Amino acid sequence: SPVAGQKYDYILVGGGTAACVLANRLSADGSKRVLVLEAGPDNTSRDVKIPAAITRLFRSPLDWNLFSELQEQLAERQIYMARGRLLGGSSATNATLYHRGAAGDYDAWGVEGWSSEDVLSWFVQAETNADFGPGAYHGSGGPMRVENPRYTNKQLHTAFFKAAEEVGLTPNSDFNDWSHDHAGYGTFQVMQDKGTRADMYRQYLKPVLGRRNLQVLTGAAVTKVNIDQAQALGVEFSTDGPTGERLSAELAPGGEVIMCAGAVHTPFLLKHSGVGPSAELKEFGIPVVSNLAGVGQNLQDQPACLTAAPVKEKYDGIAISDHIYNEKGQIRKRAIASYLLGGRGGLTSTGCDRGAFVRTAGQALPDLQVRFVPGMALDPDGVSTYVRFAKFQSQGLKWPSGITMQLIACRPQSTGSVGLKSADPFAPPKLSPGYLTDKDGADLATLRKGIHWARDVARSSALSEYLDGELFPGSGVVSDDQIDEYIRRSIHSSNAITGTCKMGNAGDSSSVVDNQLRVHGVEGLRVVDASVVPKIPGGQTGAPVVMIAERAAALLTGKATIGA
């Protein structure tokens, strides 16, 4: 009905991070008709604009509310896996940390045309940085906005840095400068524009919505790609949930469907379209169009656990919880004024934007990311404690002042999977993060050693000044076995999720797409989202997604080639 009688040069399945970049670059010259189908609503929420309102976005109507299958290795728990559901996707709901990982992360992909030297100019093209001028590693002029965080906790941020120096870690002045080693302590840059979230809807899509050749539908759930026998024809979707009429948007001759539904929903939708392991499709009576074993395999996510400690009574009130709430759970006037007057102060913080990358045991690249928060977790699950913090508003209670260190396995060895639980394309996917399943126990050892590192930092003179005991994991958790059980019971997502539609070289039979991002065995079908990442880089995954989307757009518009 909104597509009746229309023919599209490009149909984007999803209106998230990658889709926003592609909708912008593909519609640019006026010659191509682009459709974007997003299941979620328009991006208008003030909870998206204000970085600290990340707390409110978890388990909200702007999230998919996904839970994993029971995880026998994690004390028989389902794991919550946050995912954005609105224009901008997970860029509209993420912690805004700007990370590329190390050059060695892209070289480890072993994909022709996607080496560290190949990708660097695509990160640089995307970037405008408030704190780094143009150079080998930074651009000026791209649509992204990156800056140093405009909240600083004067006591606790500097005490973390001095504590890290004291235990023997060195400062890293730029975690995205590939000329120096990734390890070290310091400040994470953020995808913000003077303290407001600079998500890919705001930076790429919203400024071009006036273009005649670009049509964006929200509340549009894709149910499958229509494939002829194997040639993509377009896509089926409902604008009215499960009971809605299945509409079909149709490709023009020479047109392409681009999958932009992310590392959870892209392999889910491929499987519903007959692209996936034939046994999984047959289970639910889906005809096999392309028997690709790797669809939904190779799920990489970075698992987390945390430590937390209160400050001494004399330091009551110095935490970011004290900067955002008064002692009855009212948003502080000073925080609202600082945010509106100059884009500064606690409401500009997602909390976890200072930290470190650490080698626990002489690895080629750091295995551990630490995120320091100048506020105290009240749950060993940091995502649950952010939900608690949002729900705390107006309860008339005082959040106790302290700190948290979140420990992340940033280059994990474990893998999981996404598949089907049902023939219904509106049902949730069958999701397994597979945390701590790697044969050598390397991911558990990383997090155990992370806990030891966080305790070494909290014990240093610099932080000892402020701290008064330890809340998590606490005095009952000391031996290796006690720590390992604490990790099993508290492990949560740091919200990466990549690699479920892996790009590969010629002759890599685990791959779903080639180095041109084309799905094996289907014409006119590509994947441009985190699904394609062969091996997860260290650090958060949003900037690498934007880099892939920029380079894919340059490929599709004929401004660049891949391989030569």
Ligand SMILES: Cc1cc2nc3c(=O)[nH]c(=O)nc-3n(C[C@H](O)[C@H](O)[C@H](O)COP(=O)(O)OP(=O)(O)OC[C@H]3O[C@@H](n4cnc5c(N)ncnc54)[C@H](O)[C@@H]3O)c2cc1C
């Ligand atoms: C809570 C959280 C915290 C994070 N923290 C950070 C961080 O600090 N920094 C960082 O760089 N990265 C972070 N990440 C990761 C980063 O945001 C993602 O890796 C990145 O945004 C993924 O982009 P994408 O295009 O692959 O997918 P998404 O941005 O998730 O886009 C997928 C889109 O597809 C839509 N969709 C799904 N199914 C359908 C369907 N059937 N029909 C139509 N549309 C559909 C979704 O609603 C969504 O809008 C975070 C992620 C989250 C969720």
Ligand SMILES: CCCCCCCCCCCCCCCCCC(=O)O
């Ligand atoms: C932990 C809770 C997070 C708090 C987030 C909400 C704070 C509300 C402050 C009062 C409203 C702020 C003014 C409106 C600004 C809207 C955002 C923007 O347009 O940049």
Ligand SMILES: CCCCCCCCCCCCCCCCC
């Ligand atoms: C966005 C401002 C939040 C302040 C919250 C105070 C409590 C601190 C808890 C940190 C929790 C663990 C690490 C971060 C989890 C990130 C989702």
